[PDB]
Write an enzyme that holds these catalytic residues in place. Structure first.
Site, short mmCIF file in Angstrom:
data_model
loop_
_atom_site.label_atom_id
_atom_site.label_comp_id
_atom_site.label_asym_id
_atom_site.label_seq_id
_atom_site.Cartn_x
_atom_site.Cartn_y
_atom_site.Cartn_z
N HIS A 281 34.46 35.77 5.42
CA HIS A 281 34.65 35.69 3.98
C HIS A 281 34.05 34.41 3.43
N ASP B 58 3.03 32.95 -12.25
CA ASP B 58 3.83 33.38 -11.11
C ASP B 58 4.22 32.18 -10.27
N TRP C 119 34.90 28.76 8.51
CA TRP C 119 33.51 28.68 8.08
C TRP C 119 32.90 27.32 8.40
N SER D 114 15.19 30.10 5.29
CA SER D 114 14.90 30.65 3.98
C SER D 114 15.21 29.64 2.88
N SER D 115 16.32 28.91 3.01
CA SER D 115 16.69 27.95 1.98
C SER D 115 15.65 26.85 1.85
N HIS E 2 29.12 18.77 1.70
CA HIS E 2 29.44 18.52 0.30
C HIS E 2 28.22 18.70 -0.59
N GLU F 216 26.17 20.86 -0.26
CA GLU F 216 26.09 22.31 -0.43
C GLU F 216 26.90 22.76 -1.64
N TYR G 266 27.59 21.08 -4.21
CA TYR G 266 26.87 20.63 -5.39
C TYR G 266 25.57 21.40 -5.57
N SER H 257 23.77 25.50 -19.83
CA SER H 257 23.05 24.76 -20.86
C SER H 257 22.15 25.68 -21.68
N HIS I 259 35.29 12.54 2.21
CA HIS I 259 36.60 12.88 1.66
C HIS I 259 37.12 14.19 2.23
N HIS I 260 36.32 14.85 3.05
CA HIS I 260 36.75 15.97 3.87
C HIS I 260 37.36 15.53 5.19
N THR J 58 29.78 14.04 -14.33
CA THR J 58 30.23 15.41 -14.56
C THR J 58 30.97 15.54 -15.88
N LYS K 284 28.50 15.84 -18.97
CA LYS K 284 27.96 17.18 -19.18
C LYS K 284 28.97 18.07 -19.88
N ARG L 110 46.64 26.49 5.17
CA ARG L 110 45.53 27.42 5.09
C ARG L 110 45.31 28.12 6.43
C1 HEA Z 1 31.07 24.67 -6.38
C2 HEA Z 1 31.93 24.23 -5.49
C3 HEA Z 1 32.61 22.91 -5.62
C4 HEA Z 1 32.51 21.88 -6.63
C5 HEA Z 1 31.76 21.64 -7.92
C6 HEA Z 1 33.46 20.84 -6.15
C7 HEA Z 1 33.64 19.68 -6.85
C8 HEA Z 1 34.48 18.67 -6.48
N1 HEA Z 1 35.26 18.68 -5.35
FE1 HEA Z 1 35.39 20.10 -3.98
N2 HEA Z 1 35.50 21.52 -2.61
C9 HEA Z 1 34.84 22.70 -2.58
C10 HEA Z 1 33.94 23.13 -3.51
C11 HEA Z 1 33.59 22.41 -4.63
N3 HEA Z 1 34.06 21.18 -4.97
C12 HEA Z 1 35.19 23.50 -1.38
C13 HEA Z 1 34.58 24.86 -1.12
C14 HEA Z 1 36.15 22.72 -0.64
C15 HEA Z 1 36.85 23.10 0.65
C16 HEA Z 1 35.89 23.15 1.83
C17 HEA Z 1 36.72 23.48 3.05
O1 HEA Z 1 37.57 22.66 3.43
O2 HEA Z 1 36.52 24.57 3.62
C18 HEA Z 1 36.28 21.51 -1.49
C19 HEA Z 1 37.12 20.52 -1.11
C20 HEA Z 1 37.31 19.37 -1.81
C21 HEA Z 1 38.25 18.35 -1.29
C22 HEA Z 1 39.14 18.33 -0.07
C23 HEA Z 1 38.36 18.32 1.22
C24 HEA Z 1 39.37 18.46 2.32
O3 HEA Z 1 40.02 17.45 2.67
O4 HEA Z 1 39.51 19.58 2.85
C25 HEA Z 1 38.15 17.33 -2.30
C26 HEA Z 1 38.87 16.03 -2.32
O5 HEA Z 1 38.66 15.20 -3.18
C27 HEA Z 1 37.18 17.80 -3.31
C28 HEA Z 1 36.84 17.08 -4.41
C29 HEA Z 1 35.95 17.50 -5.35
C30 HEA Z 1 35.63 16.67 -6.53
C31 HEA Z 1 36.26 15.33 -6.73
C32 HEA Z 1 34.65 17.42 -7.28
C33 HEA Z 1 33.99 17.07 -8.57
O6 HEA Z 1 32.61 17.48 -8.66
C34 HEA Z 1 34.77 17.61 -9.76
C35 HEA Z 1 34.46 16.78 -11.00
C36 HEA Z 1 34.86 17.51 -12.26
C37 HEA Z 1 35.87 17.11 -13.06
C38 HEA Z 1 36.71 15.91 -12.76
C39 HEA Z 1 36.18 17.93 -14.29
C40 HEA Z 1 35.14 17.65 -15.36
C41 HEA Z 1 35.30 16.25 -15.91
C42 HEA Z 1 36.12 15.97 -16.93
C43 HEA Z 1 36.94 17.06 -17.56
C44 HEA Z 1 36.26 14.58 -17.50
C45 HEA Z 1 36.37 13.47 -16.45
C46 HEA Z 1 37.56 13.69 -15.54
C47 HEA Z 1 38.12 12.69 -14.85
C48 HEA Z 1 37.63 11.27 -14.93
C49 HEA Z 1 39.30 12.98 -13.96
N4 HEA Z 1 36.70 19.03 -2.98
C1 HEA Z 2 31.68 32.25 -3.20
C2 HEA Z 2 32.69 32.07 -2.39
C3 HEA Z 2 33.97 32.83 -2.50
C4 HEA Z 2 34.42 33.88 -3.38
C5 HEA Z 2 33.85 34.70 -4.51
C6 HEA Z 2 35.81 34.13 -2.93
C7 HEA Z 2 36.59 35.08 -3.53
C8 HEA Z 2 37.88 35.35 -3.17
N1 HEA Z 2 38.58 34.73 -2.17
FE1 HEA Z 2 37.93 33.30 -0.98
N2 HEA Z 2 37.28 31.86 0.20
C9 HEA Z 2 36.06 31.28 0.19
C10 HEA Z 2 35.04 31.59 -0.65
C11 HEA Z 2 35.11 32.55 -1.61
N3 HEA Z 2 36.19 33.33 -1.90
C12 HEA Z 2 35.93 30.24 1.23
C13 HEA Z 2 34.65 29.46 1.41
C14 HEA Z 2 37.20 30.20 1.91
C15 HEA Z 2 37.61 29.32 3.06
C16 HEA Z 2 37.29 30.08 4.34
C17 HEA Z 2 38.11 29.55 5.49
O1 HEA Z 2 39.35 29.60 5.41
O2 HEA Z 2 37.51 29.10 6.48
C18 HEA Z 2 37.97 31.24 1.20
C19 HEA Z 2 39.25 31.50 1.56
C20 HEA Z 2 40.03 32.44 0.97
C21 HEA Z 2 41.41 32.63 1.47
C22 HEA Z 2 42.16 31.92 2.56
C23 HEA Z 2 42.08 32.64 3.90
C24 HEA Z 2 43.05 31.96 4.83
O3 HEA Z 2 43.02 30.71 4.91
O4 HEA Z 2 43.84 32.65 5.49
C25 HEA Z 2 41.87 33.68 0.59
C26 HEA Z 2 43.22 34.29 0.60
O5 HEA Z 2 43.55 35.10 -0.24
C27 HEA Z 2 40.76 34.02 -0.33
C28 HEA Z 2 40.84 34.98 -1.30
C29 HEA Z 2 39.82 35.30 -2.14
C30 HEA Z 2 39.96 36.35 -3.17
C31 HEA Z 2 41.25 37.10 -3.31
C32 HEA Z 2 38.69 36.39 -3.85
C33 HEA Z 2 38.15 37.21 -4.96
O6 HEA Z 2 38.66 38.54 -4.86
C34 HEA Z 2 38.49 36.62 -6.32
C35 HEA Z 2 38.10 37.56 -7.45
C36 HEA Z 2 36.72 38.11 -7.19
C37 HEA Z 2 36.42 39.42 -7.29
C38 HEA Z 2 37.44 40.44 -7.69
C39 HEA Z 2 35.02 39.86 -6.99
C40 HEA Z 2 34.08 39.41 -8.10
C41 HEA Z 2 32.65 39.66 -7.67
C42 HEA Z 2 31.97 38.79 -6.91
C43 HEA Z 2 32.59 37.51 -6.42
C44 HEA Z 2 30.56 39.12 -6.50
C45 HEA Z 2 29.62 38.95 -7.69
C46 HEA Z 2 28.20 39.07 -7.20
C47 HEA Z 2 27.16 38.88 -8.02
C48 HEA Z 2 27.36 38.52 -9.46
C49 HEA Z 2 25.77 39.02 -7.48
N4 HEA Z 2 39.67 33.25 -0.06
O1 LIG Z 3 33.32 19.80 -1.36
O2 LIG Z 3 33.92 19.36 -2.60
CU LIG Z 4 33.33 17.69 -0.67
#
Ligand code: HEA
Ligand code: HEA
Ligand SMILES: [O-][O-]
Ligand SMILES: [Cu+2]
Ligand SMILES: CCCCCCCCCCCCCCCCCC(=O)OC[C@H](COP(=O)([O-])OCC(O)COP(=O)([O-])OC[C@@H](COC(=O)CCCCCCCCCCCCCCCCC)OC(=O)CCCCCCCCCCCCCCCCC)OC(=O)CCCCCCCCCCCCCCCCC
Ligand SMILES: CCCCCCCCCCCCCCCCCC(=O)OC[C@H](COP(=O)([O-])OCC(O)COP(=O)([O-])OC[C@@H](COC(=O)CCCCCCCCCCCCCCCCC)OC(=O)CCCCCCCCCCCCCCCCC)OC(=O)CCCCCCCCCCCCCCCCC
Ligand SMILES: CCCCCCCCCCCCCCCCCC(=O)OC[C@H](COP(=O)([O-])OCC(O)COP(=O)([O-])OC[C@@H](COC(=O)CCCCCCCCCCCCCCCCC)OC(=O)CCCCCCCCCCCCCCCCC)OC(=O)CCCCCCCCCCCCCCCCC
Ligand SMILES: CCCCCCCCCCCCCCCCCC(=O)OC[C@H](COP(=O)([O-])OCC(O)COP(=O)([O-])OC[C@@H](COC(=O)CCCCCCCCCCCCCCCCC)OC(=O)CCCCCCCCCCCCCCCCC)OC(=O)CCCCCCCCCCCCCCCCC
Ligand SMILES: CCCCCCCC/C=C\CCCCCCCC(=O)OC[C@H](COP(=O)(O)OCCN)OC(=O)CCCCCCC/C=C/CCCCCCCC
Ligand SMILES: CCCCCCCC/C=C\CCCCCCCC(=O)O[C@H](COC(=O)CCCCCCC/C=C/CCCCCCCC)COP(=O)(O)OCCN
Ligand SMILES: [K+]
Ligand SMILES: [Zn+2]
Ligand SMILES: [Zn+2]
Lengths: 459, 91, 98, 186, 62, 90, 121, 180, 107
Positions: free
Chosen positions: A60, A90, A125, A152-153, A228, A230, A232, A243, A277-278, A303, A306, A428
């Site tokens: 997943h 193109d 994952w 590919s990426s 991380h 990734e 971003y 935008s 921070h992970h 952030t 924006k 989790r």
């Molecule tokens: C698109 C995906 C995405 C994005 C954008 C982000 C964005 C951010 N993530 Fe996230 N992050 C994940 C995907 C993402 N993350 C995933 C997938 C994990 C779990 C991975 C795993 O463990 O499997 C994770 C995990 C994760 C962790 C925990 C890691 C761990 O211990 O397991 C933390 C801890 O700080 C973190 C922080 C942040 C922060 C600080 C941002 C910042 O970019 C957010 C900044 C945005 C705001 C703050 C809001 C907008 C700003 C304002 C409204 C005004 C200013 C606000 C303040 C000054 C507070 N992320």
């Molecule tokens: C893009 C990434 C992505 C997306 C869409 C989702 C979507 C969802 N995920 Fe998540 N999820 C992850 C990434 C994502 N997840 C990751 C990275 C983890 C951590 C893995 C790990 O534990 O190691 C995780 C873990 C995770 C867990 C924890 C598993 C565990 O620890 O035991 C659960 C539990 O309910 C969950 C639930 C869901 C549900 C209910 C939805 C969705 O059903 C929410 C609603 C969405 C829909 C109803 C579908 C909408 C359509 C699309 C998303 C496709 C659209 C396609 C195009 C537009 C081309 N997710």
């Molecule tokens: O990874 O936030």
């Molecule tokens: Cu991170």
């Protein structure tokens, strides 16, 4: 022809089509999880078959990130409009563009075939060793997919960077988002390939990097150094789409264009140096933890700029224009949802708070609000904006207020309880849980089944 | 439901011939949507979802009456002693 | 009676003066009347700075005055905690093997 | 920002200036094919990026982040006992690494740790000074701060002498209560 | 230009149909998941087991 | 400049900010030095900052301290309210 | 205040009412809204006001509902969402009677503060 | 009025599902035999021979379009000479009723208006400044608490008891000092 | 920042006392899904689609000049749906400057 086509616009469609197809498997895997977590005790997975659940969560996560969202936002929309946003005809490297989509498909077939043929076990994952290197051959197959996906990426990143050479117009904000994402891939992918090779070496070449006297934490540093960037890389293309949509649908020039561009650049620079921070709970040095915590908070500054620039784009727009279009609603919904996800990210950036919230469903909800809602809705919003240009039909999504409202309500039902569960606390990657967490898990499960039903209404 | 004609703060500005155009109505009509029973059903509906979202489903309480009573007895007889208003809460 | 006097006083004092434009624009030619129509995109009706402050200031007083009203009338203070007495703990843990 | 190519642009001497930027901006450019066109495009970029007021805010942020980044990297190599670059100590067993052990204690007592540790009472409600005393002497004895941390700590009074219960929750009072019962030494 | 299902739904006021759909979808989800556990009676949810947990909490001052 | 809108810098210091490219470089350099200085001058210095007997007491501290000292609040606040565990059961 | 102190070249309406007009409307029917405040069939053009005569820049405002129902229509003639009401009628009233606006805003703020504080406390 | 009734006549309800009769009744897969339609199938879709099996990009049916003089046919503009001047009349697209169907009447009025732009440069610069530094001040407010709590975790404490914990698959092992 | 074109007072003086801003409707009309004819084959449906392009439409002012469909980005300038080959002739991005050379003029 169908496979021999080099037209970038055709290839862009293929990326969107393939992501939807793979999305179904990802949705199925997601649906399996919430059904199991409906209540304590086994529901659809035998206790003797708990290994399958570990594979479900592992796939997943992998499929959704590398095979669904990344191709959709970085391969699908960019390949369609980026050469159009540029004044060029193109894509620069047509043949490379063709092989990139084919590579993605072959890696997908390898992954799903491994489910059917290999024993089903999971390691998350993130593929943390030593668990990843003591597993069965399914782990070997998943590594091949990731390495193949990496090819590919990187070649796609090379393709977009070449637009700077040939662009005959102005570099719009959207073009900047794709370019900077390509830069992140170029610098982060080779590090990922190196560490993945070490995982293969231990799995397949009798290497001893991940046994005693070999620091297992070494993997976490190299992996998250790519991990991380990734996240971003996933979101930055989404920022570019928002935008364009907000400016176009409001007839307002993008405010602070240079501030937007510099914010994207700043995020990438900061995003490349905050990976640890992970790794708060592993026991890093005091000064190391303070550094990463301090720099992680700084990412909010660009952030935030924006976010505010987006808000002023919507403010003051003409009232006569109908505001119920699905693309506009999704773009506005992104701002509301992203703020929730980002704020919770700042909360878990504080390492002492993170001690309690690491490896809990609070982290799950954090990245679902950003990715499962925000990124998906941004991808949906962009596709809807380009409906006339793309030309697809046979769906009712352009003006469908029911779909937007129901999607927003139900996805929030899935993931808001997961914040609460995080403090309760529920770990989790867990199948069974204590009886006193059932209420919140039950509510989220009802949310999951409801969302799937809504998708059937678009057709 | 043949709604009434609300003349308004300045009756002179509603004194002309409306023809087929609709005539202004009391504000209660807007909140009832002209007593549409389905707006009232969709209204009763609105309050149920809101209640579930903030307080949970209290429509399951009649079925939970007997099993709640047993839980209350268990807390009082065997659970840790409660003090003052704390006796009102059972986990 | 008193309400009318105070209402008139505030009305007179709040009448806006012409804005000090922060943008470089020309002077409209003398004798130029209405040139546009009401089908133009609506321009939001904004309060003048004095009125905005008075209205906004009143709300701030209201919201915090209401907060004090609730805390002093609607809510109650904690009574002293019940006295703590030495109690007998249970003889055995319920899962202690016999 | 001039609008006529005839008016020159002022430039300073050094490695980051208008003249320095002009020399290098068009090195990889296919669009700056003649002087008139080259200057127009050069001034277009300079006007758009360097005359944008908000852009300077990001320049400050990158400087600060990079400055911290370089300092932390350098500090680890120079001072962290666990980081080895020379090999003399790595060729001996652990008990013989006398030179490396010299870094331990000073690296354990940075200035900021001493300054901010006394402010633990802004977070802990009960016994905030539970770990203040340590007879070994590797660190200074800690004394609780007299004021709350500036910023968002409006929950607690500005100064701790304003809190009627602060002294009752100190580790000393709790130790007195439990010693009176013979419950524990601490 | 639309099938019957959309012509029916799109005819009604949005705030009439929308609240009904939200409740209906949630109710269907709960019903669907309740199908697989009709009549399941784990012992740990019986009154006797509930009392025992209360005894444990009192002893452990939970 | 620090916490300074650069439009003010452009207006009040035209000659200094005449070369914008150079001005941008100074912005980066100045803030780079600050970050570098904080680590090695505020955080790093060993065996410093432990003089807890010299806590800063601002004028606001003394104003509130004297106000409570004049009344009995300061004595009452510092008094230990409870030093026994169990209350006597009558 | 755009017409009052900023711009003198847009038509300035007369306030018919500082409250919205409630009316039942039908989908598939086009309605014409008075933008001058002098029609006698408010909130609709009566055929004799400035809007009907196209005088002084006043024109009828076309409007059409998506669904049948009861909708609120601007009476102040300056609501941003005109012809529909969004609260601009109250805002424009406060400009004319700021003393009254303070009383209402204080009362509304007082209620909001009490309820929010009572529930959270 | 109902605009659908205006172009109801053009829309005749269909007979077959998906617009095709069963292949047995009519073979739409075969290439059309009509002269000038050799590149199309019977149902009008492009034939596989034209697009795949004998695609011109692969070297089939080589026919260079450009002539000897390097020219290709170009259609001229609609020129008119009047008032001692040569004019070109532009091609206006057909009425949207012909292409879309709805009758072009009772169109809502949308006036010309120039771009909606934020003014007052001085005010706008301050807003941009706040967008950057208000988040910065918040970050600074968090920084000091972050340092303090980090130091609390790593404070050197005078511990008197040690418990060693080993994690194994899948149980925990505890080692404690037995009293003498 | 951009705040519109600068205007001089003399430029606002009308040549007649009855001048008011022209009331020309910039709503291009009523549209929906492009509706093809069953009789039209693939080639003629392509012509139909090419004749329904909103970006080929404009509004003619009172002096004969037309204000065309305009967009912030060139994505809205290709035919909808996008054809295989879009920009056969390179789109021109027109910049303005005050520079001039004598060869362009004649006395
Ligand atoms: C698109 C995906 C995405 C994005 C954008 C982000 C964005 C951010 N993530 Fe996230 N992050 C994940 C995907 C993402 N993350 C995933 C997938 C994990 C779990 C991975 C795993 O463990 O499997 C994770 C995990 C994760 C962790 C925990 C890691 C761990 O211990 O397991 C933390 C801890 O700080 C973190 C922080 C942040 C922060 C600080 C941002 C910042 O970019 C957010 C900044 C945005 C705001 C703050 C809001 C907008 C700003 C304002 C409204 C005004 C200013 C606000 C303040 C000054 C507070 N992320
Ligand atoms: C893009 C990434 C992505 C997306 C869409 C989702 C979507 C969802 N995920 Fe998540 N999820 C992850 C990434 C994502 N997840 C990751 C990275 C983890 C951590 C893995 C790990 O534990 O190691 C995780 C873990 C995770 C867990 C924890 C598993 C565990 O620890 O035991 C659960 C539990 O309910 C969950 C639930 C869901 C549900 C209910 C939805 C969705 O059903 C929410 C609603 C969405 C829909 C109803 C579908 C909408 C359509 C699309 C998303 C496709 C659209 C396609 C195009 C537009 C081309 N997710
Ligand atoms: O990874 O936030
Ligand atoms: Cu991170
Ligand atoms: C020194 C030593 C020497 C040793 C010597 C030894 C030599 C050994 C040789 C080794 C090499 C062998 C192979 C050589 C290849 C040659 C290529 C070449 O020149 O071809 C010219 C040749 C030209 O053909 P032609 O003869 O002119 O005739 C073509 C037609 O007339 C009409 O032309 P056309 O091109 O339009 O027609 C092709 C196309 C036309 O048909 C269509 O396109 C159908 C319409 C589309 C329907 C919608 C599809 C879904 C949407 C997909 C969106 C993304 C598309 C991405 C782009 C396409 C990617 C394939 O149909 C296909 O070919 C099949 C299309 C498949 C699309 C797949 C999309 C995703 C599927 C997702 C599956 C989900 C379920 C999961 C489980 C199953 C997993 C497998 O190429 C082709 O057109 C045919 C290619 C066929 C080979 C494909 C091989 C794929 C292998 C996949 C991996 C399988 C491994 C695991 C098995 C698991 C099974 C379960
Ligand atoms: C908890 C009770 C639950 C009741 C069940 C649910 C019933 C259904 C409600 C549906 C409401 C839909 C409203 C429209 C969407 C909103 C969009 C919008 O704002 O744009 C409008 C419009 C924008 O221009 P437009 O183009 O005309 O509108 C575009 C539409 O989006 C175009 O959308 P469209 O094409 O779909 O057309 C929609 C059209 C047609 O809309 C409708 O058909 C809706 C008509 C109103 C129905 C309201 C029924 C309320 C029943 C309450 C029952 C309470 C007792 C429950 C049991 C308690 C047991 C303990 O809307 C309008 O004409 C706009 C009217 C202005 C919004 C009015 C919303 C508030 C209504 C009053 C709520 C009162 C709640 C009291 C709760 C007390 C609990 C104890 O102006 C505004 O934005 C309005 C500003 C807000 C004004 C209302 C302020 C709130 C009301 C007072 C406070 C109430 C709470 C007190 C709590 C006290 C606790 C102790
Ligand atoms: C003590 C040590 C001292 C050492 C001293 C060393 C001195 C070195 C001097 C260097 C001077 C450079 C001179 C050339 C300037 C650039 C000109 C240029 O590119 O011409 C266009 C030229 C095309 O010619 P054209 O026809 O004139 O282009 C027309 C435009 O496309 C049409 O566009 P338009 O007309 O609309 O707009 C014009 C302009 C519009 O853009 C601009 O004008 C941008 C202007 C700013 C650029 C940055 C300047 C540096 C700023 C200060 C940074 C200081 C940091 C200090 C840290 C210290 C820490 C200790 O377009 C471009 O510049 C397009 C290219 C942009 C590429 C950006 C790639 C990402 C890099 C990150 C962005 C920069 C962020 C700076 C920091 C931000 C935060 C404050 O571009 C190419 O040839 C493209 C080649 C693509 C190759 C890609 C693959 C390369 C390998 C990648 C490896 C991994 C890279 C990792 C990067 C990580 C980034 C975060
Ligand atoms: C007098 C009334 C009361 C006054 C109180 C005063 C308080 C102090 C404020 C300062 C004084 C204000 C005085 C203003 C005087 C007037 C000045 C003036 O120029 O007037 C004319 C001026 C413009 O006049 P105009 O141009 O003629 O147009 C007037 C129109 O009506 C157009 O008007 P508009 O466009 O300005 O409409 C404003 C509307 C515009 O808003 C929008 O458009 C919003 C659009 C996005 C909606 C997003 C919805 C939420 C999404 C949630 C995501 C998760 C989904 C989960 C789903 C689950 C499944 C269902 O704003 C809102 O709706 C308020 C949104 C506020 C944030 C909402 C989030 C609250 C979160 C709180 C923390 C939660 C923690 C939870 C902890 C656990 C549980 C307890 O009007 C105003 O200034 C109106 C201001 C009125 C604002 C009242 C907002 C009250 C909201 C209360 C929220 C309470 C939350 C309770 C929970 C707390 C937990 C900790
Ligand atoms: C990685 C090991 C590689 C070994 C290579 C051997 C060849 C040496 C020459 C090339 C490498 C440069 C290092 C030379 C060091 C010479 C002096 C020396 O021996 O220093 C040792 C000393 C520590 O050794 P120990 O005494 O064992 O540890 C004490 C407690 N920590 O090493 C150091 O402090 C220097 C090592 C780091 C040098 C590199 C610079 C460090 C800062 C990098 C900042 C990076 C961020 C970006 C900077 C941007 C700048 C514009
Ligand atoms: C010809 C071209 C050559 C280019 C070569 C480029 C080389 C670098 C490529 C990227 C890899 C960086 C090296 C990896 C650094 C890992 C360090 C690490 O993990 O150390 C942390 C500690 O590290 C830190 O303190 C974190 C510092 C962050 C290092 C980041 C270096 C790479 C940054 C690349 C960002 C992108 C480029 C930015 C350029 C400038 C932008 C303006 C672990 O600490 P503890 O486990 O507690 O152990 C301490 C003692 N036991
Ligand atoms: K379960
Ligand atoms: Zn009128
Ligand atoms: Zn009004």
């Amino acid at each position: 022809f169908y496979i021999l086509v080099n037209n970038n616009k055709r290839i862009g469609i293929y990326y969107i089509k393939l992501s939807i197809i793979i999305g179904i498997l990802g949705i199925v895997l997601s649906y399996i999880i919430r059904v199991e977590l409906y209540n304590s005790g086994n529901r659809i997975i035998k206790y003797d078959n708990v290994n399958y659940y570990n594979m479900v969560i592992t796939l997943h996560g992998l499929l959704m990130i590398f095979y669904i969202i990344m191709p959709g936002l970085y391969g699908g929309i960019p390949l369609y409009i980026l050469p159009i946003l540029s004044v060029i005809t193109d894509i620069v490297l047509p043949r490379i563009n063709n092989i990139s989509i084919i590579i993605v498909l072959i890696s997908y077939i390898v992954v799903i075939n491994s489910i059917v043929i290999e024993y089903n076990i999971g390691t998350g994952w993130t593929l943390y060793p030593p668990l990843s290197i003591i597993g069965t051959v399914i782990v070997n197959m998943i590594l091949y997919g990731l390495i193949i996906i990496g090819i590919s990426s990187i070649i796609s990143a090379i393709n977009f960077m070449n637009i700077l050479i040939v662009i005959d117009g102005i570099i719009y904000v959207y073009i900047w988002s794709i370019i900077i994402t390509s830069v992140l891939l170029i610098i982060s992918l080779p590090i990922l390939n190196g560490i993945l090779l070490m995982i293969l070496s231990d799995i397949y070449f009798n290497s001893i990097y991940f046994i005693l006297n070999g620091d297992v934490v070494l993997y976490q540093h190299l992996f998250w150094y790519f991990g991380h960037p990734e996240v971003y890389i996933l979101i930055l293309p989404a920022f570019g789409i928002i935008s364009i949509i907000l400016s176009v649908l409001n007839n307002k020039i993008i405010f602070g264009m240079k501030s937007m561009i510099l914010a994207i650049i700043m995020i990438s620079i900061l995003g490349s140096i905050v990976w640890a921070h992970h790794i708060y709970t592993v026991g890093l040095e005091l000064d190391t933890k303070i550094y990463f915590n301090n720099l992680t908070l700084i990412i909010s500054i660009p952030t935030g700029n924006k976010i505010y620039n987006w808000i002023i784009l919507y403010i003051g727009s003409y009232n006569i224009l109908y505001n119920g279009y699905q693309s506009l609603i999704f773009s506005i919904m992104f701002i509301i949802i992203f703020i929730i996800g980002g704020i919770t990210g700042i909360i878990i950036s504080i390492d002492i708070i993170d001690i309690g919230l690491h490896d809990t469903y609070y982290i799950v909800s954090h990245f679902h609000y950003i990715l499962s809602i925000g990124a998906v809705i941004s991808l949906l919003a962009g596709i809807l904006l380009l409906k006339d240009i793309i030309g697809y039909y046979n769906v009712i999504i352009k003006i469908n207020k029911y779909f937007g409202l129901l999607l927003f309500i139900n996805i929030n039902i899935i993931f808001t309880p997961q914040f609460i569960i995080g403090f309760n606390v529920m770990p989790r990657r867990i199948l069974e849980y204590s009886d006193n967490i059932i209420v919140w898990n039950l509510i989220s499960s009802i949310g999951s089944i409801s969302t799937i039903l809504i998708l059937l209404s678009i057709f | 439901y043949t709604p009434s004609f609300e003349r308004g703060l300045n009756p002179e500005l509603t004194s002309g011939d409306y023809g087929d155009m609709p005539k202004p109505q009391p504000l209660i009509d807007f909140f009832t949507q002209n007593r549409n029973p389905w707006f009232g059903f969709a209204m009763f509906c609105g309050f149920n979802f809101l209640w579930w979202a903030f307080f949970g489903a209290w429509q399951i309480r009649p079925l939970w009456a007997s099993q709640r009573k047993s839980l209350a007895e268990a807390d009082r007889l065997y659970g840790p002693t409660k003090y003052g208003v704390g006796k009102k809460y059972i986990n | 009676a008193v309400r009318s006097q105070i209402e008139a006083a505030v009305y007179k004092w709040t009448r806006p003066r012409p804005p000090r434009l922060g943008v470089a624009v020309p002077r409209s030619p003398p004798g130029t009347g209405i040139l546009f129509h009401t089908n133009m995109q609506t321009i939001r009706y904004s309060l003048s700075p004095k009125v905005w402050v008075l209205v906004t200031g009143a709300a701030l007083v209201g919201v915090f005055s209401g907060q004090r009203f609730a805390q002093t009338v609607l809510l109650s203070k904690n009574p002293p905690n019940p006295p703590r007495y030495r109690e007998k703990p249970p003889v055995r843990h319920p899962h202690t093997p016999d | 920002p001039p609008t006529r190519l005839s008016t020159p642009l002022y430039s300073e001497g050094g490695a980051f200036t208008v003249n320095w930027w002009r020399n290098r901006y068009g090195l990889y450019s296919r669009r700056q094919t003649d002087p008139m066109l080259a200057e127009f495009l050069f001034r277009q970029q300079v006007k758009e990026w360097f005359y944008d007021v908000p852009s300077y805010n990001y320049a400050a942020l990158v400087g600060l982040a990079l400055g911290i980044l370089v300092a932390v990297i350098w500090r680890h190599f120079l001072f962290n006992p666990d980081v080895y670059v020379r090999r003399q100590e790595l060729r001996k067993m652990w008990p013989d690494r006398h030179r490396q052990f010299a870094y331990a204690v000073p690296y354990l007592n940075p200035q900021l740790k001493n300054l901010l540790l006394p402010y633990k009472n802004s977070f802990i409600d009960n016994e905030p000074d539970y770990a203040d005393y340590n007879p070994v002497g590797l660190r200074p004895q800690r004394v609780m701060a007299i004021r709350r941390i500036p910023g968002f700590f409006w929950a607690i009074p500005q100064y701790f002498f304003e809190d009627p219960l602060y002294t009752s929750c100190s580790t000393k009072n709790m130790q007195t209560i439990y010693k009176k019962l013979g419950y524990s030494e601490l | 230009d639309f099938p019957w299902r959309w012509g029916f739904v799109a005819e009604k006021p949005f705030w009439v149909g929308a609240p009904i759909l939200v409740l209906g979808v949630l109710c269907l989800g709960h019903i669907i998941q309740t199908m697989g556990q009709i009549g399941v009676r784990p012992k740990r949810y019986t009154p006797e087991w509930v009392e025992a947990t209360k005894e444990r909490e009192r002893a452990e001052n939970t | 400049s620090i916490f300074t809108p650069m439009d003010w810098m452009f207006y009040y210091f035209p000659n200094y900010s005449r070369d914008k490219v150079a001005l941008m470089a100074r912005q980066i350099k100045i803030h780079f030095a600050i970050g570098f200085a904080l680590v090695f001058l505020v955080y790093h210095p060993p065996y410093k900052g432990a003089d807890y007997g010299n806590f800063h007491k601002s004028p606001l501290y003394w104003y509130k301290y004297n106000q409570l000292e004049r009344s009995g609040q300061l004595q009452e606040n510092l008094r230990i309210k409870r030093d026994w565990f169990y209350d006597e059961d009558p | 205040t755009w017409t009052e102190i900023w711009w003198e070249h847009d038509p300035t309406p007369k306030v018919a009412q500082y409250r919205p007009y409630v009316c039942t409307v039908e989908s598939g029917k086009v309605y014409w809204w008075c933008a001058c405040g002098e029609s006698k069939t408010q909130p609709w053009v009566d055929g004799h006001c400035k809007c009907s005569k196209r005088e002084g820049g006043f024109r009828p405002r076309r409007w059409e509902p998506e669904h049948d129902g009861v909708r609120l229509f601007c009476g102040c003639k300056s609501c941003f969402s005109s012809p529909t009401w969004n609260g601009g009628c109250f805002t424009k009233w406060m400009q004319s009677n700021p003393a009254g606006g303070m009383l209402y805003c204080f009362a509304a703020a007082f209620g909001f503060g009490t309820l929010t504080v009572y529930r959270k406390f | 009025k109902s605009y659908y009734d205006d172009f109801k006549d053009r829309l005749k309800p269909g007979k077959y599902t998906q617009g095709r009769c069963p292949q047995s009744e009519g073979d739409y897969r075969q290439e059309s035999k009509t002269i000038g339609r050799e590149h199309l199938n019977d149902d009008g879709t492009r034939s596989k021979r034209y697009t795949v099996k004998e695609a011109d990009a692969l070297g089939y049916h080589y026919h260079p379009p450009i002539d000897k003089k390097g020219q290709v046919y170009v259609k001229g503009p609609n020129t008119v000479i009047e008032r001692g001047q040569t004019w070109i009349k532009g091609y206006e697209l057909p009425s949207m009723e012909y292409t879309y169907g709805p009758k072009q009447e009772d169109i809502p009025f949308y006036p010309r208006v120039k771009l909606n732009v934020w003014g007052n440069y001085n005010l706008v610069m301050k807003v941009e400044f706040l967008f950057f530094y208000l988040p910065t001040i918040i970050v600074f407010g968090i920084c000091i608490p972050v340092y303090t709590i980090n130091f609390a975790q790593e404070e050197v404490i005078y511990t008197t008891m040690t418990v060693k914990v080993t994690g194994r698959q899948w149980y925990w092992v505890y080692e404690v000092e037995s009293p003498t | 920042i951009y705040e519109g074109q600068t205007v001089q007072e003399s430029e606002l003086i009308p040549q007649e006392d009855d001048w008011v801003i022209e009331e020309t409707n910039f709503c291009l009309g009523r549209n929906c899904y492009v509706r093809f004819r069953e009789e039209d084959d693939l080639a003629r449906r392509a012509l139909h689609q090419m004749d329904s392009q909103l970006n080929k439409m404009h509004t003619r002012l009172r002096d004969g000049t037309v204000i065309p469909y305009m967009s912030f980005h060139p994505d809205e300038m290709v035919d909808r749906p996008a054809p295989i080959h879009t920009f056969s002739e390179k789109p021109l991005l027109k910049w303005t400057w005050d520079e001039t050379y004598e060869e362009a003029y004649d006395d």
